[PDB]
Amino acid sequence: FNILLATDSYKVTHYKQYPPNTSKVYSYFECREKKYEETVFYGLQYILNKYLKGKVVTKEKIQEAKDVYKEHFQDDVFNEKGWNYILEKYDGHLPIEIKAVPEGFVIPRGNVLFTVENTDPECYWLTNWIETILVQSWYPITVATNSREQKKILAKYLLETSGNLDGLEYKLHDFGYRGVSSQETAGIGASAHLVNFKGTDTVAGLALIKKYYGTKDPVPGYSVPAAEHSTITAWGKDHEKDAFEHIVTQFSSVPVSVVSDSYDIYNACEKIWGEDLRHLIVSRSTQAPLIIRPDSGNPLDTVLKVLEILGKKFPVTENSKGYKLLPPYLRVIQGDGVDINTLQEIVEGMKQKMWSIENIAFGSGGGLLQKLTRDLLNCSFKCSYVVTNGLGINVFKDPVADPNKRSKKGRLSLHRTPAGNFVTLEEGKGDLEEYGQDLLHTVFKNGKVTKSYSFDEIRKNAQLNI
């Protein structure tokens, strides 16, 4: 990895575009306002450690970058002198200070989450060089936020239909490993989901958390044995019952998820599970349920008909809230077409038919880790303050045709209001101490990570009210 090749091409040319005698560029990140009213701040620490800390400039990296940019631009615009300065003066350590809200913090939209400034007048151009790398924070922030919003919905419906939150942290399982754009994305995205839940099949998340954040527990996330279409269909069309019986017998003492829609989900539930193999299901421990997995059709319609089928073949109870409950040896996971909108629709549909959310868990792949953009929470990095000819100026954009893109002015700080909410003070007004101490902390200075959070603290910070 070469940080001199880890920026948008045009930023290579920006050192020639700032006002002459500019000693400071000060920039901030926010999830711009215009529903996702609050964001989980998560993922910066990964970027600080993997990409920004320590000796990130070498003589070889300056030469590689010079040679690429000469061909890329068909011209010699690369700031060799500026980068050589970093190498010689700071032994290739970035003269940058980053202040950030603690990771796991749940902050309303339109608040400063981190700030970036150069610590050496010569490196005024460096603040926005690292915009591109830092702005990729959008992704863990957005996954963590969207996952937490889904947990709020599950919390509401579980509490309404059951009268408690038991199993909440296992209700949304990460299926997204194959559905993300890369290995690196898999690790970051799966880690962001595990801020809110403990169930993942995206193994890449575990090593990232252990290396960059750390947990008391040996692993931050768990799974159980489960079938896929290959392990059912390989038995032949006429032997689906043989595949089911072999799989539940192999995993007789742990929870086992069995995809049941290879040929006919409704036949599999009513005839195979419900009659042919019923004796191998009703004998299973409460600690080792069969989890039937439909994987096709209208997600709500399929879940309701699956539960109606199972309710007639298996002994259903009515819980303290008046909602129907399968026996403890039998559960359902809907793992197809699940996103925040269809999750809401399924649990509301279940509640209307008097089915407890105790009966169901969700698996989400593309919905959870991939079908997300930087536009969803308007994650944005902008310059708010420069010093030119020794005088500080408050700078901003305010496009006539889009007031939602107006950026904040001057030196920024995050404060508690008297009512215990958050406010971002602009124009250095934090210095007036009318709102107490700045809640941002120095997390990075002059190539060192100066403040860090365990995954355990991040989880605690990201908890729901209830």
Ligand X SMILES: C[C@@H]1CC(=O)N(C2CCCC2)N=C1c1ccc(NC(=O)N2Cc3ccncc3C2)cc1
Backbone angles phi, psi at 437, to 5 degrees: -80, 145
Could you give the C-alpha distances from 13 to 65, 193, 375, in angstroms and in order? Answer: 13, 37, 26
The helix (run of H) or strand (run of E) holding residue 234 is none
Q: Which does 165 bind (CB under 5 to 8 A by kind): its own copies, ligand X, none?
A: none
Residues, the chain = 466
Binding status of residue 328 toward ligand X by CB under 6 A: no
Tell me which residue of 195, 241, 155, 187 sits closest to 465, measured CA to CA: 155
Is 114 near its own copies (CB under 8 A)?
no
Stretch 235-264 residues interacting with its own copies (CB under 8 A): 235-237, 239, 242-243, 246-247, 250-251, 254, 257, 261-264
Return the residue of 95, 140, 205, 255 that touches ligand X, per CB under 6 A.
255
- The stretch near its own copies (CB under 8 A) out of 71-79, 110-118, 153-161, 317-325 is 71-79
**Region near its own copies per CB under 8 A, out of 105-113, 155-163, 394-402, 411-419:** 394-402
- First CA to last CA across the chain, in angstroms? 44
User: In this complex, which beta carbon is closest to ligand X, that of residue 16 or of residue 35?
Assistant: 16
- Contacts of the segment 309-312: beta carbons below 8 A, 24+ positions apart: 309/266, 309/269, 309/270, 309/274, 310/269, 310/273, 310/274, 312/270, 312/274
Of 340, 368, 386, 439, which lies in the binding site for its own copies, with binding defined by CB under 8 A? 386
Q: Are strands 22-31 and 379-388 parallel, antiparallel or unpaired?
A: antiparallel
For its own copies, the closer of residues 97 and 240 by Cβ is: 240
Stretch that binds ligand X, among 118-126, 168-176, 343-351, 409-417 (CB under 6 A): 168-176
| Number of residues in contact with ligand X under rule CB under 6 A | 20
Contact 78, 10 (CB under 8 A): no
Per CB under 8 A, does 421 bind its own copies? no
Q: Which of residues 338-377 bind ligand X (CB under 6 A)?
A: 361, 363
Rounded CA-CA distance 121/118 in Å is 7
> Token digits for 288?
């080792």
CB of 284 vs its own copies, minimal distance in Å = 15
Q: Which of residues 340-369 bind its own copies (CB under 8 A)?
A: 365-366
In the complex, what is the shortest distance from the CB of residue 224 to ligand X, in angstroms, rounded to a whole number?
Answer: 5
Residues forming beta bridges with residue 360, ordered by sequence position: 332
Region from 110-118, 271-279, 294-302, 324-332 binding its own copies, contact rule CB under 8 A: 294-302
CB of 6 to ligand X, least distance (A): 14
- Is residue 335 a contact residue for ligand X (CB under 6 A)? yes
**At closest approach, how far in Å is the CB of 178 from its own copies?**
4
Position among 4, 40, 107, 226 found at the interface with ligand X (CB under 6 A)? 226
Establish whether 229 is an annotated binding residue.
Answer: yes
Distance separating alpha carbons of residues 290 and 283, to the nearest angstrom: 11
H or E, element range at 128: helix 126-129
**CA-based radius of gyration for the chain:** 26
What residue 85 binds from its own copies, ligand X, none (CB within 5 to 8 A, per partner kind)?
A: none
**CA nearest 31: which of 154, 181, 135?**
135
Instruction: Give, as ranges, the residues between 7 and 36 that touch ligand X (CB under 6 A).
Output: 8, 10
**Which option in its own copies, ligand X, none does residue 333 bind, with CB closer than 5 to 8 A by kind?**
ligand X
Nearest Cα to Cα of residue 4 among 74, 86, 75, 73: 86
H helical segments located in 324-424: 340-352, 366-369
Contacts of 385 (CB under 8 A, 6+ apart): 24, 26, 392, 393, 394, 395, 410, 411
Number of amino acids touching its own copies (CB under 8 A): 117
Angle among Cα 325, 287, 342 to the nearest 5 degrees reads: 50
Does residue 145 touch its own copies according to CB under 8 A? no
Is 285 a binder of its own copies (CB under 8 A)?
no
Which residues of the shown chain bind ligand X in the complex (CB under 6 A)?
8, 10, 167, 170, 173, 175, 199, 201, 222-224, 226, 255, 257, 291, 293, 333, 335, 361, 363
Binding residues for diphosphate: 178, 229, 293
Binding residues: 178, 201, 229, 293-295, 335-336, 366, 374
